[PDB]
Design a protein around this nucleic acid. Structure first.
Lengths: 149, 64, 133, 135, 214, 100
RNA sequence: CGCUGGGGAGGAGGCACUCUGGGGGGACCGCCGGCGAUAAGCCGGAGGAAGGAGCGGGCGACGGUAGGUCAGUAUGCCCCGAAACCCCCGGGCUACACGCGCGCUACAAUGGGCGGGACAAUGGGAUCCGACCCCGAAAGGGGAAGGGAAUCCCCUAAACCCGCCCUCAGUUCGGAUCGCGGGCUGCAACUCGCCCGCGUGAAGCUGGAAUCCCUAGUACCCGCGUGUCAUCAUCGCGCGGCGAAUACGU
């Protein structure tokens, strides 16, 4: 019924499938020629990765809002194979996250607090709870102990 | 080959050059010699009441 | 009524609340039935399976955990839940069952780390550099 | 319908493989640049090569010829700001080796530290040679 | 991909991992009966306890023992199968998650193939891999002999489990075969007395040497 | 109006002295107080090497300076402020006062 | 928000739970059967958050080692005193046929990659930490709240779980070495600095004789502050997360 009652990966898939019917969310010019982080070597192996990215950003804003573009940069980082040198954690880049948040605002799913992160609007809060109610109505057929929630 | 049970009764002491062996007294409870307590070396942690499997029933061991 | 309770484990504290209800158990906003992984899920569910059906079917439980890894959190939560169940039911039968099964359910663990010493400080107090001769 | 050895410019590749890895066999073309080429060409990089029509082969080679005109970004290219033309450009196979050689030779001609090191066969990027670099 | 009905499992009774019974099992070896723990439980995880107490190895479940013997990194400073198996970063050391999953898939394959209970199968395997005899070096008058000495029921188990896990680690080194499948093969062979079992091989080798030195 | 006093020192006895003094001066008069409130202790650690040369195994020397802190709010009544500023504080204690 | 019962954010207002830091209790072979000697103590067993100097540390004697330090300060004799004193401006300690010590990275599946889900602690911060917003593909650039340390920042750590591709191959292992390009710190980056993007793709397929570290929240494995610091950590001192195997001896 609510976001906190279903698994995140499933929810993100079921939300990214719908993010495409929304037209204000489109990949930019440089999406195919770009790597998702200094901490990476090869490019994403999917053609529709932008929408998964923006769904994840939506849901992280929901959960941990108000949140700005450094905590998400940290959550989208990892350890870099540096060769003969040993491994260290490194942060991602700050154009993908920013363009995603701008497009979400254009669609009206998030708003910026003046000086404190960024948050969800009521319709942005409706979208996810709808999708989660659907996914839960589905899972309750396989996990018959999910009804009480 | 199927051995013969033997119940431990008394720990005598530790033997061996390194100290990983233990001389012990055992009584038989299944075979041609049920009774006939004997002395036998034993490798590993052991405690009284335990029960061991013996392949040879006549190979009584040395004292210490 | 309401009963509050606590539970500890290495660099981890859990606070639990219990009352009358339907049978729901949330650990930090997400239900137990979908906790991951399974090795951390069985740890939390053990007392709810031991207690039984007619006892848990009529209680709603809530837990908030903070600090120290998924295993620490799960154990702290199991401890809190068991203490709260006993405080709420008042059954020495349940107490003895839990203590037979595992006594740390109600008598928590008391082990923290040991500080390190100056030969290989990162590795630990008793790991040391390799000598040469 | 299926082939076992396709022939992109000069070089031959393994049709039993995916295209992004089969194109990795042309010196000057990695996995990332291969992915970019295939995306600007309109081809799934997960299809087993061999199902590659001369249509697609010709398109890929014309791409490789002039990448910055088809929109390959100038930064994602082998040789930006060439010495005597500007003209951020790309080089594969037979052209590449000659560029390396000509660069090192012009370093040698002006009697520079890097060219002298290239001659003697020693390191060039500031490493320490007392305990390692043993033949 | 696992189905959801297995990715999200919820036990309804007190059975090992919530799936397999432990009361129908049996043991006919009296020397080991009191050292094989078959208590009805769900999660076989003891967080290090029962280790500093000398005989704490008798209150732990054989399944947890096998799991902690599975948490291996090949063999160092000695050799098994004719090679050093040194990994150093790719090993499941301090990963009971992965060890649990391995033993789970193993018992799955065993139940699928044998049509019996994997714990009963494991008990018979441990029996048929339990050595009753070994060697040692005793001294009198200042010379070194080589004698045959009986082994205790607490060390028999240790060697059996160690050898099973070694055979598993061996059948999987740089081959298409997996750790779980190799462990299942090892257990089946040890139970059915097939020389393909590192464990049965080692047992017969030990007893042979000892009978010789007798 | 309220006044907030912060106290820091390497000695617990001076802190207890000042606390007792202001607590009693505020009690004998009619003023609702606050505290004493303990804040966490600040530890300055320094690990150095003993030998002045290189030779010899490495034996390290760990020095520590602990600093204890206290906080109070006193409500800054008519005479309370002027009778509290008239305190005889040792010179091993750092006392500051802020009006809110 | 569904099936109407459940679920979150402010704010008042409270300290109950958590936590912080002051004082105090509690465990002593004390009770219970042996052995020894009727003593000293050891061993069962009981009871007990914890048992047998509870656990981890600090302080380390009379003296020796002609052990190391005059290149940390202090200090006697000789020596330079217009130099061997005191400043600047450029080079070197980074030079390389080789022999050794300590480590890092690997030689695969007990895994590589891409995409998504998670959970810490210790410590530090003035021309210092910098949230939040905006440019740039990335490295990085321009504004700037708050903070003089339970108030703000550095800080959503990694190993781990899920789904797809690779399926025992010098490879989607490995990642040195070289080329073209873009930037920071600094009075000055060739000699001789760190970082980024695209290409190139070297030995290595588990290791002889020998040898080292470790007894419980310990070792193995995973990453994190800090010390040095105008920049630069494969190092030192510490921090936590996951977590065993064997012996209770000679």
């Amino acid at each position: 019924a609510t976001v906190y009652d279903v698994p995140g990966d499933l929810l993100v898939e079921r939300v990214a499938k719908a993010l495409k019917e929304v037209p204000e969310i489109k990949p930019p010019e440089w999406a195919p020629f770009v790597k998702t982080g200094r901490h990476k070597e090869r490019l994403p192996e999917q053609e529709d990765w932008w929408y998964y990215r923006v769904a994840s950003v939506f849901r992280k804003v929901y959960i941990d809002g108000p949140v700005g573009i450094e905590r998400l940069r940290t959550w989208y980082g990892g350890r870099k194979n540096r060769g003969h040198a040993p491994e260290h954690f490194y942060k991602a880049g700050g154009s993908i996250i920013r363009k995603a948040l701008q497009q979400l605002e254009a669609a009206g799913f998030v708003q910026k607090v003046p000086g404190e992160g960024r948050i969800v609007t009521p319709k942005g809060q409706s979208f996810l709870d709808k999708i989660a109610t659907e996914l839960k109505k589905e899972l309750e057929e396989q996990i018959p102990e999910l009804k009480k929630y | 080959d199927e051995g013969y049970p033997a119940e431990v009764i008394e720990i005598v002491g530790r033997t061996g050059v390194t100290g990983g062996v233990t001389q012990v007294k055992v009584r038989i409870l299944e075979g041609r010699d049920k009774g006939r307590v004997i002395r036998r070396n034993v490798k590993g942690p052991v405690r009284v009441g335990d029960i061991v499997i013996l392949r040879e029933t006549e190979r009584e061991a040395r004292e210490i | 009524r309401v009963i509050q309770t606590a539970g500890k484990r290495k660099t981890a504290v859990a606070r639990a609340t219990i009352r009358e209800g339907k049978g729901r158990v949330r650990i930090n906003h997400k239900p137990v039935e979908i906790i991951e992984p399974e090795i951390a899920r069985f740890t939390i569910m053990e007392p709810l399976i031991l207690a039984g059906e007619e006892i848990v079917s009529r209680v709603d439980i809530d837990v908030k955990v903070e600090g120290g890894g998924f295993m620490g959190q799960a154990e702290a939560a199991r401890v809190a839940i068991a203490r709260a169940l006993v405080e709420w039911t008042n059954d020495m039968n349940l107490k003895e069952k839990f203590m037979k099964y595992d006594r740390t359910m109600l008598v928590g663990d008391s082990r923290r780390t040991e500080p390190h010493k100056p030969n290989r400080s990162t590795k630990g107090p008793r790991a040391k550099r390799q000598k040469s001769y | 319908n299926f082939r076992h050895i396709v022939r992109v410019a000069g070089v031959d590749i393994d049709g039993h493989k995916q295209v992004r890895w089969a194109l990795t066999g042309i010196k000057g073309i990695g996995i990332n640049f291969a992915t970019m080429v295939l995306r600007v060409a309109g081809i799934d990089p997960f299809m087993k090569a061999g199902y590659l029509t001369d249509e697609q082969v010709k398109k890929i080679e014309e791409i490789l010829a002039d990448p910055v005109a088809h929109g390959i970004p100038a930064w994602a290219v082998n040789r930006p700001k060439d010495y005597e033309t500007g003209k951020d450009m790309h080089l594969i196979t037979a052209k590449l080796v000659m560029a390396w050689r000509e660069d090192v030779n012009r370093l040698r001609r002006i009697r520079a530290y890097r060219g002298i090191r290239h001659e003697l066969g020693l390191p060039v990027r500031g490493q320490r040679t007392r305990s390692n670099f043993r033949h | 991909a696992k189905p959801l009905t297995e990715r999200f499992f919820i036990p309804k009774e007190v059975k090992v991992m919530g799936r397999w019974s432990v009361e129908d099992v049996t043991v006919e070896d009296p020397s080991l009966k009191p050292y094989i723990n078959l208590d009805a439980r769900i999660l076989p995880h003891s967080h290090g306890r029962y280790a500093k107490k000398p005989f704490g190895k008798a209150n732990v479940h054989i399944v947890e023992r096998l799991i902690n013997k599975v948490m291996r990194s090949g063999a160092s400073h000695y050799k098994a199968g004719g090679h050093f198996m040194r990994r150093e970063h790719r090993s499941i050391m301090s990963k009971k998650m992965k060890a649990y999953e391995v033993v789970k898939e193993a018992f799955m394959i065993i139940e699928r193939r044998t049509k019996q209970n994997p714990i009963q199968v494991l008990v018979k395997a441990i029996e048929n891999s339990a050595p009753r005899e070994d060697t040692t070096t005793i001294a009198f008058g200042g010379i070194r002999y080589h004698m045959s000495v009986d082994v205790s029921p607490l060390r028999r188990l240790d060697i059996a489990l160690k050898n099973i896990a070694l055979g598993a680690s061996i059948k999987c080194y740089r081959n298409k075969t997996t750790y779980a499948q190799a462990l299942a093969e090892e257990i089946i062979a040890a139970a059915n007395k097939d020389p393909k079992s590192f464990a049965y091989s080692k047992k017969e080798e030990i007893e042979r040497i000892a009978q010789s030195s007798r | 109006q309220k006044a907030r006093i912060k106290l820091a020192s390497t000695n617990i006895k001076a802190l207890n002295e000042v606390t007792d003094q202001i607590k009693q001066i505020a009690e004998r008069t009619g003023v609702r107080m606050s505290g004493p409130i303990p804040l966490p202790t600040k530890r300055i650690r320094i690990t150095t090497r003993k030998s002045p040369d290189g030779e010899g195994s490495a034996t390290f020397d760990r020095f520590e300076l602990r600093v204890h802190k206290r906080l109070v709010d006193i409500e800054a009544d008519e005479r309370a402020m002027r009778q509290i500023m008239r305190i005889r504080v040792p010179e091993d204690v750092t006392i500051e006062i802020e009006l809110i």
